[PDB]
Amino acid sequence: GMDAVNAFNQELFSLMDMKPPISRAKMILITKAAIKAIKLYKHVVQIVEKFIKKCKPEYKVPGLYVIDSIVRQSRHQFGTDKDVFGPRFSKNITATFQYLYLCPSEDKSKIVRVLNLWQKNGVFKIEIIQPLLDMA
Amino acid sequence: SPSYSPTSPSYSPT
Numbered sequence: 001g002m003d004a005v006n007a008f009n010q011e012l013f014s015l016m017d018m019k020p021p022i023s024r025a026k027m028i029l030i031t032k033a034a035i036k037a038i039k040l041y042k043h044v045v046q047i048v049e050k051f052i053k054k055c056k057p058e059y060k061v062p063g064l065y066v067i068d069s070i071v072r073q074s075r076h077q078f079g080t081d082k083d084v085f086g087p088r089f090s091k092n093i094t095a096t097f098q099y100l101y102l103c104p105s106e107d108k109s110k111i112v113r114v115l116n117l118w119q120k121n122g123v124f125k126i127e128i129i130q131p132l133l134d135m136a
Numbered sequence: 137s138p139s140y141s142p143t144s145p146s147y148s149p150t
Binding site for chain 1: 137138139140141142143144145146147149
């Protein structure tokens, strides 16, 4: 319910008081909270997109890593065909990446590395990935 | 504490 959505909001926004790079352990806490709230996945996606819109530039790569971790965990746990998160994140993905590329110069390579992993592993189709690579 | 890596495998529900 909305208690699980609130708990996800709390877990993700707590990053703003932590120094990047963000730990594997913290990412697991955020990802477990996302999956706990999966019956309200639309709210989870909205919260992650809000984080990426609002956060300081140092937190753009952490925000992208949250998308990566959630989408991969969901595909792993539920199957590539049944995952709700990838398709939902795909709706506003252009706007999301326009925000991510406001990161500091030394972080752009980290965004391109994730897009190349998504392409190679079929997390999204090339029709989605290529324009995001072109944006870099 | 080790940093998140996008090549690290997903966890199994422990």
